[PDB]
Design a protein around this nucleic acid. Structure first.
Lengths: 137, 119, 107, 98, 568
RNA sequence: GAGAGGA
DNA sequence: CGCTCTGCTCCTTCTCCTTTCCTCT
DNA sequence: CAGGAGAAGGAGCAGAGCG
């Protein structure tokens, strides 16, 4: 594959491509973009349900072609596989007919409610009664 | 047969951690609302320990003394039987141990919303 | 007592021991031609009631789990139709000792 | 009457099986001219036929007679008996001579 | 190096062997009831269905009176579910089970009081919030209460009227229900009893067919089973209207307890709101929250229609349950709602004007549009019954909620790559390492590392395909599946054990430093800590209290994290 | 360890 | 009325035992 | 290296009920 380096699948180029595709999808699927979240979740607005907030694979192809960041020719199937990989981690929510619109969690994690675990702080040092996931295994 | 992805340097001693190193994110500092729950978790529990339904247990000399006399009883212990009971719920065989014929007395577990935690 | 002729379907055997108050038993016609109790090697069995069993247990200071048991479906047990926990007294005859009594229970 | 003890047990109860065991052992040891008291033979028959069914003196017939795990392990099939007693968590009370 | 003589002391290895259910139940009962009750509950969990004689035999504290006092203590607090069966052959015997709902009630006490206070719009008035908190505290601590005793405890007529009104309001809301012998009968044995008296009564003539006879018996039994299950939830006791002054008053003689099913439905609503807060805006989350609060009372039970536990599911007709549930899930009159009701009940503090952008207050159209955007997402937050009519599908929302919670727990504990691998294996099916690399786009070294670290739990299962006569390695291939049921069950057990460990540590710390804790209440010196005790005692008491506070906060977090796996 | 008396 | 599970019963292929020890070499 | 005896899976039919 075009994404292999020295016979192995490198991640740095893949991570950069994932980041730029994710940012493009987020900008396309939100009213104004990241500047809708500088104030916080208390004022952000969202697109109407009837609008086409998603972004098909072809839009991603056009953006990556006009950006010239991948620096190599990428087929629509390869970009589809890449954005399907990005579908995991609760990013790039999948919509029928090969459409993508970023999840709200993906932009919430850029900065009890277990879902937003990134906000919670690690336990203090030399503290007892701290819960460990593998304490029973 | 050493595997492809291993070398002799990393093998030789079998050190298992025996201590956890993967913590859940629930260990963060408490919040004011969480501090409330606790109190309604420490208070409850405290009330039932003071409650008549405990039977938790799994000086006292027989010599009469004027010192122990003129001293008040510690409290008015409320046993399990004295509590009012809905007889139709319990099994029949336990009737011999309850207060089937005993003076009615019910204790009210008052709730103090003010925290009893120091500072 | 159901004396079947030649063969019993296993489903019938499954249905046999499902009656709380009463009970039924199966006897092959071939299995009933000469009664077992009249064979020379079969000693005289006697069914002991509850009172006799209690007397025996008090006399020998035993329990119901220590006497030499006799299996249920034993040909001389199902003949008398002993229920589980019934003591049978056996008049065993030996040439060097005459007659003597040995006790069994149905398990 | 047949020579086979188990056949007599199947067709004539367990008491007839005990009688057959005693009589056949006595006949075998009398045809050979040896003088063994019949009371020992009777004790052997009773030992074989007191659990309810005819039980041999192999490692299979002993496992259905003696509960003591240590005795059975000492006799035959040691590790299997010890592991079974560990699994089923048997609680033998040491009273046998072994 | 840590010697084993120290590992056995400071590694929590002795308790690591206890069964999580037995550990948690025994620890809870020991903390809230005592040691005799803990022993009895431990015997009940370990053996199951013990009579009084067997409980006496299996416990060193074999005092018959002690066992009976423990049993009445556990029954009034409904920590046990007895059963009175009659032996045909002779003397009848009564067998006791262990009641999971009562122990859960002991577990959710703080959360229960928080939900009671918050859901009823009485904390705002600030005057009867204390009254309702005391009411729920007494109900949950004493087990079962009749209103006349509580009213006779107080003297003021105004207080009596306020308490009676709060009782009526709470009973109407659904948090309080009449307690009957049905609450002290196992559901499995209840279904066993109801299977007869509908199968035995069939005449000895040819029944349709034996399979059809059993089908008729099951169909007849399910009806009255559901009827008797819902009988406590019919409000047949609150309607004692007009004894005087023509007001709605609860019947004095009827005993009332707390409805655990209602509280757990509230917990499920809160979990769904938290999930929705990660998919829609704050305003839309508020709309979903108020819709959940409106439909909460009429929602189906969290656990099951109580028929799943009763018997075998079916040959394959267990899907009928789903279908039947789905039918009620779509056709209970309270479930279906339109934007008009939400706008009627929506608080005025919500802007709901500029939240939605048309193209790249309390308006009915805007609320309908927000409901539409809720229903549009792949997560079935809402589903459309009629044009403009929505209902929250609980049947199709449990699996996605469980999957999301489990995936995020994996993401938080292990690396995010663990979540990526788990979701990749789940979306795919029986995927080799090469296809994993192709469809995950990361290093195979880290793929193998994460897979090995993840197989330690029942997250990813290895399927062995043997390519030789012997199934030994180096020739066979190894595919990977997920088996989400194994993962959910294992994580539920892990969380139960963690909660039990936290409670055990809390009780141990309370016992170790019990001297100054006892002194704090020896002479009613509470609130005078600084002015009577030595500074070292002050520091020790402060540390003990802070540790207990942290323990209970972590227990609340663990409860909020494991409720979802407890759902079904 | 295994080769063989031996009674 | 064939069809389709259970259930039973063969049938085959597997596992655990074979004094006493009493020496030397 | 022979001899004996159990436990465990395939495998081929009766038997029951059925839609």
């Amino acid at each position: 594959g075009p994404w292999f380096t020295d016979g192995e699948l490198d991640i740095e180029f893949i991570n950069s491509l994932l980041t730029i595709v994710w940012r493009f999808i987020s900008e396309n699927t939100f009213p104004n973009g990241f500047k809708n979240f500088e104030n916080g979740p208390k004022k952000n607005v969202f697109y109407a349900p009837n609008v086409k907030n998603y972004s098909t694979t072809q839009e991603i192809l056009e953006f990556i072609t006009a950006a010239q960041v991948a620096n190599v020719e990428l087929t629509p199937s390869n970009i589809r596989s890449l954005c399907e990989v990005l579908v995991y981690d609760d990013k790039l929510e999948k919509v029928t007919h090969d459409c993508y619109r970023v999840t709200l969690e993906s932009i919430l994690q850029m900065n009890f409610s277990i879902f937003n675990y990134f906000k919670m702080f690690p336990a203090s040092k030399h503290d007892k009664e701290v819960v460990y996931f593998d304490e029973w295994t | 047969n050493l595997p492809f992805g291993l070398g002799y340097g990393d093998v030789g001693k079998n050190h298992i951690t025996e201590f956890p190193s993967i913590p859940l994110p629930i260990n963060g500092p408490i919040t004011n609302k969480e501090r409330s729950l606790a109190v309604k978790y420490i208070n409850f529990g405290k009330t039932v320990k003071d409650g008549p339904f405990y039977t938790g247990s799994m000086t006292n000399d027989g010599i009469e003394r004027y010192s122990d006399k003129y001293l008040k009883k510690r409290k008015i212990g409320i046993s399990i039987d004295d509590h009012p009971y809905n007889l139709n719920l319990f099994p029949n065989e336990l009737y011999n141990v309850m207060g089937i014929n005993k003076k009615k007395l019910l204790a009210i577990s008052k709730f103090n919303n003010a925290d009893d935690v120091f500072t | 007592i159901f004396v079947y002729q030649n063969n019993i379907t296993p489903s019938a055997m499954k249905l046999v021991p499902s009656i709380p108050p009463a009970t039924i038993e199966t006897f092959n016609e071939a299995a009933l031609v000469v009664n077992i109790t009249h064979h020379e090697l079969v000693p005289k069995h006697i069914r002991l009631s509850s009172d006799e069993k209690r007397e025996l247990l008090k006399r020998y200071r035993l329990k119901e789990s220590q006497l030499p048991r006799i299996q249920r479906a034993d040909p001389v047990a199902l003949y008398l139709g002993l229920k589980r926990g019934e003591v049978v007294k056996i008049i065993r005859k030996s040439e060097t000792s005459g007659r003597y009594a040995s006790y069994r229970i149905c398990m | 009457t047949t020579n086979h003890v188990l056949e007599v047990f199947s067709v004539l109860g367990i008491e007839a099986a005990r009688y057959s065991i005693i009589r056949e052992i006595n006949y075998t040891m009398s045809n050979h001219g040896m003088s063994v008291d019949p009371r020992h033979i009777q004790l052997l028959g009773d030992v074989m036929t007191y659990k309810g069914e005819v039980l041999g003196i192999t490692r299979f017939g002993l496992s259905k007679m003696r509960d003591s795990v240590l005795q059975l392990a000492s006799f035959e099939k040691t590790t299997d008996h010890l592991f079974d007693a560990a699994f089923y968590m048997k609680k033998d009370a040491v009273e046998g001579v072994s | 190096l840590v010697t084993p003589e120290d590992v056995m002391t400071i590694s929590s290895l002795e308790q690591r062997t206890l069964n999580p259910d037995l550990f948690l139940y025994k620890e809870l009962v020991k903390a809230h009831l005592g040691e005799r009750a803990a022993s009895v509950i431990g015997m009940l969990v370990a053996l199951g269905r013990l009579s009084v004689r067997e409980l006496v035999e299996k416990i060193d504290g074999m005092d018959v009176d002690s066992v009976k006092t423990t049993l009445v203590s556990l029954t009034q607090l409904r920590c046990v579910k007895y059963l009175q069966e009659t032996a045909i052959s002779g003397k009848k015997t009564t067998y006791y089970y262990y009641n999971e709902e009562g122990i859960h009630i002991l577990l959710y006490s703080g959360l229960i009081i928080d939900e009671i206070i918050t859901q009823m719009r009485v904390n705002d008035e600030e005057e009867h919030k204390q009254l309702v908190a005391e009411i729920v505290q007494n109900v949950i601590s004493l087990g079962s209460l009749t209103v006349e005793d509580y009213l006779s405890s107080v003297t003021s007529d105004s207080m009596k009227y306020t308490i009676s009104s709060l009782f009526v309001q709470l009973c109407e809301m659904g948090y309080l229900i009449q307690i009957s012998k049905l609450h002290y009968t196992p559901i499995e044995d209840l279904w066993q009893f109801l299977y007869e008296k509908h199968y035995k009564n069939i005449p000895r003539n040819s029944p349709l067919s034996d399979l059809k006879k059993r089908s008729q018996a099951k169909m007849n039994a399910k009806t009255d089973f559901a009827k008797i299950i819902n009988k406590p939830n019919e409000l047949s006791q609150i309607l004692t209207v007009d004894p005087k002054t023509s007001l709605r008053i609860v019947k004095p003689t009827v005993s009332l307890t707390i409805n655990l099913d209602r509280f757990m439905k509230g917990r499920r609503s809160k979990q769904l709101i938290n999930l929705a807060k990660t998919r829609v805006g704050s305003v839309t989350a508020q709309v979903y929250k108020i819709a959940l609060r409106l439909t909460e009372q009429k929602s189906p039970k969290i656990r099951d229609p109580l028929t799943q536990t009763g018997l075998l599911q079916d040959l394959e007709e267990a899907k009928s349950f789903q279908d039947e549930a789905e039918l009620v899930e779509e056709k209970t009159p309270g479930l279906t709602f339109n934007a008009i009701d939400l706008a009627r009940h929506l608080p005025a503090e919500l802007d709901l004007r500029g939240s939605l952008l048309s193209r790249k207050p309390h308006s009915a159209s805007l609320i309908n549009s927000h409901l539409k955007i809720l229903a549009s997402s792949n997560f079935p937050f809402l589903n459309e019954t009629k044009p403009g009519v929505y209902y929250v599908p609980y049947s199709k929302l449990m699996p996605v909620l469980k999957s999301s919670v489990y995936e995020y727990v994996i993401a938080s504990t292990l690396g995010p790559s663990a979540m990526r691998l788990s979701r990749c294996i789940r979306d795919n099916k029986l995927v080799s390492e090469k296809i994993i690399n192709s469809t995950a786009l990361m290093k195979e070294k880290d793929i193998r590392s994460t897979l090995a670290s993840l197989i330690r739990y029942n997250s990813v299962e290895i399927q062995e395909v043997p390519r030789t006569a012997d199934r030994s390695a180096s020739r066979a291939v190894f595919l990977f599946r997920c088996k989400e049921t194994h993962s959910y069950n294992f994580m539920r057990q892990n969380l139960e054990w963690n909660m039990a460990n936290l409670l055990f540590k809390k009780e141990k710390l309370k016992q170790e430093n019990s001297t100054l804790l006892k002194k704090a209440n020896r002479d009613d010196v509470k609130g005078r800590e600084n002015e009577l005790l030595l500074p070292s005692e002050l520091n020790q008491l402060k540390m003990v209290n802070e540790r207990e506070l942290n323990v209970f906060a972590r227990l609340s977090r663990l409860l909020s994290l494991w409720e979802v796996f407890q759902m079904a």
